[PDB]
Design a protein around this motif. Structure first.
Motif, PDB file in Angstrom:
ATOM      1  N   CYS A 223      43.510  31.278  47.195  1.00 10.43           N
ATOM      2  CA  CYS A 223      44.488  32.330  46.938  1.00 10.43           C
ATOM      3  C   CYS A 223      45.284  32.048  45.669  1.00 10.43           C
ATOM      4  O   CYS A 223      45.540  32.960  44.874  1.00 10.43           O
ATOM      5  N   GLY A 231      46.547  40.436  48.388  1.00  7.51           N
ATOM      6  CA  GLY A 231      45.272  40.046  48.942  1.00  7.51           C
ATOM      7  C   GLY A 231      45.147  40.320  50.435  1.00  7.51           C
ATOM      8  O   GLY A 231      46.129  40.581  51.140  1.00  7.51           O
ATOM      9  N   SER A 326      37.804  40.228  41.359  1.00 12.07           N
ATOM     10  CA  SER A 326      38.280  39.885  42.695  1.00 12.07           C
ATOM     11  C   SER A 326      37.185  39.108  43.417  1.00 12.07           C
ATOM     12  O   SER A 326      36.320  39.688  44.075  1.00 12.07           O
TER      13      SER A 326
END
Length: 545
Positions: A223, A231, A326
């Motif tokens: 992360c 997210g 992503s």
DNA sequence: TGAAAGTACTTGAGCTTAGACA
């Protein structure tokens, strides 16, 4: 004119032309009007306009198969101030206004052109006369289901305003177009074009928690590596939702949760304030197929594997609605799939128990097995995705773990096998035994086919299911053995005749069936009685009852 | 060279699940 409505799109919405050839084909065909429209494309503005744009020239009113199932209260609060006449209603208070809007529906040629409704209500008595009155009034145009919750449903009809009220062409702007699913929506649902999505910006990487010493730290740095932009982390239980949220928040990553026996009211916040960066990260299981697919979705992580390739792709599609790279990651472990399948089995079971044998019964099983293979196979993730969708296999680069290092991922896969070969022990043995034999069962368990006795069964309580897997053929074969034993005893003892022996053998077989519970024990008792009869014949005395 | 029994600590697992009735 067609050019006039194309410009009206700008006049109504604001878009000068169509974003992609997707619209240029599908909406053009809808304007012409040929047949059912089946489109798969990432959820967001595009697919919504693929049916909203035809709804502008709806020829009166356009009936949606169903804009998804919920969310509605986001598409209705998306066009009311978009120079169009749209309505929905379903929030119960509806009555206050809905009731008379149902009279505004009874009202011929209404100031409404679009009407949102979905299997949730609709089947209600407030609509059963209403739908007939509406279809008989002047017309009822179009039928858009957009999503897949038709075949993929919990009373989804698949023959609703079509088999039961087919009055116009249908629109299916889903986000998943797997070959089985598209065949189902071609058959169960009674221009069709899908973009090969590719999406190199989504770095599909799979990491195995069995090899990761500290999965929590690994996910944290995953992360953190995705910078600070919102997210998504995916797991499978609400307890897991809470556990991952707490652990991530303690690890720093501002986490959160969508469902937990909480409430729309007790989550509306968590969700909305997740778009506006108030909550950076939120976890859920399947409660994020809706809720405004935003733009800056930096990552989508799966703490536990999904339910299928279709499911995994539809979670991962809630991301990348930008140029943002992503990297979506899947956490995998043998213990996880083990659990998932065991419950997919329990589900498939209950389903079959309270139903019959369908293609979906094996479809769920082989979809989960395809997911297992995809997380276990060796190659480009995009290539596997295209193979599962049947699209052209992309030779992607810098888009998956396979193309990064040609021996590190292979080493991890090899270590996965080397990770584990082959009062606390009882549960371990039970789980291992049942999981192993689920592999023996494999796909499509089915195979029940209890054939009733044909015409003249000489069996008391013949049509009985007290003994599982004791089909009538086995039963009358055991009775055949019993009658052979009785005839041998009759020859060896010189009693009256075999005419009474028929009823005697039927009685003996029924008694043995009653005393038995399972097929193997029933056979053991049957041949035990046969051996006793043979011994009595050998001794010489007649076989008395 | 054997050799003892109860108790105060940590830790780390581990769990189906999404719509439309008050």
């Amino acid at each position: 004119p067609e050019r006039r409505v194309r410009s009206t799109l700008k006049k109504v919405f604001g878009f000068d032309s169509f974003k992609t050839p997707l619209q240029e084909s599908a909406t053009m065909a809808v304007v012409k009007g040929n047949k059912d429209v089946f489109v798969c494309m990432p959820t967001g503005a595009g697919k919504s306009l693929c049916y909203q744009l035809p709804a502008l020239l709806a020829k009166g009113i356009t009936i949606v198969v169903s804009p998804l199932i919920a969310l509605i209260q986001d598409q209705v609060d998306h066009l009311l101030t978009l120079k169009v006449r749209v309505s929905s209603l379903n929030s119960k208070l509806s009555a206050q206004e809905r009731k008379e809007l149902l009279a505004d529906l009874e009202r011929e040629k209404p100031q409404t052109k679009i009407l949102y409704i979905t299997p949730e209500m609709a089947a209600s008595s407030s609509f059963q006369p209403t739908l007939n009155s509406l279809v008989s009034r002047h017309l009822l145009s179009y039928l858009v289901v957009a999503e897949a919750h038709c075949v993929s449903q919990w009373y989804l009809r698949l023959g609703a305003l079509r088999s039961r009220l087919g009055h116009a062409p249908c629109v299916a702007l889903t986000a998943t177009a797997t070959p089985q699913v598209q065949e189902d929506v071609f058959a169960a649902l009674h221009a069709i074009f899908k973009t090969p999505c590719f999406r190199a910006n989504l770095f599909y990487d799979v990491q195995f928690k069995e090899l990761i010493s500290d999965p929590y730290g690994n996910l944290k740095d995953f992360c953190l590596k995705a910078l600070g932009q919102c997210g998504i982390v995916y797991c499978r239980t609400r307890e897991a939702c809470e556990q991952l949220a707490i652990e991530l928040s303690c690890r720093g990553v501002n986490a959160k949760a969508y469902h937990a026996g909480l409430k729309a009211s007790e989550r509306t916040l968590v969700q909305n304030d997740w778009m506006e960066e108030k909550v950076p990260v939120i976890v859920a299981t399947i409660s994020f197929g809706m809720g405004v697919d935003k733009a800056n979705v930096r990552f989508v992580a799966h703490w536990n594997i999904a339910k299928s390739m279709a499911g995994y792709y539809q979670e991962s599609g809630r991301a990348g609605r930008d140029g943002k790279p992503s990297w979506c990651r899947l956490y995998y472990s043998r213990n996880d799939r083990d659990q998932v399948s065991f419950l997919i089995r329990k589900e498939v079971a209950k389903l079959q128990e309270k139903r019959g044998n369908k293609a979906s019964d094996k479809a769920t099983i082989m979809a989960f097995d395809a997911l297992v293979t995809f997380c276990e196979e060796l190659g480009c993730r995009h290539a596997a995705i295209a193979k599962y969708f049947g699209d052209a296999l992309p030779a992607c680069a810098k888009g998956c773990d396979h193309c990064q290092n040609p021996t590190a991922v292979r080493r991890r896969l090899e270590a996965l096998e080397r990770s584990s070969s082959w009062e606390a022990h009882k549960r371990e043995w039970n789980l291992f035994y049942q999981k192993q034999m689920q592999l023996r069962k494999g796909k499509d368990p089915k195979i029940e086919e209890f054939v009733p006795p044909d015409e003249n069964c000489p069996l008391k309580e013949a049509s009985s299911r007290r003994i599982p897997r004791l089909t009538v053929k086995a039963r009358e074969h055991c009775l055949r053995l019993l009658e052979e034993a009785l005839s041998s005893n009759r020859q060896s003892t010189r009693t009256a005749d075999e005419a009474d022996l028929r009823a005697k053998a039927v009685e003996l077989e029924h008694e043995t069936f009653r005393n038995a519970k399972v097929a193997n024990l029933y056979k053991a008792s049957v041949l035990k009685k046969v051996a006793d009869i043979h011994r009595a014949s050998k001794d010489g005395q007649p076989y008395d009852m």
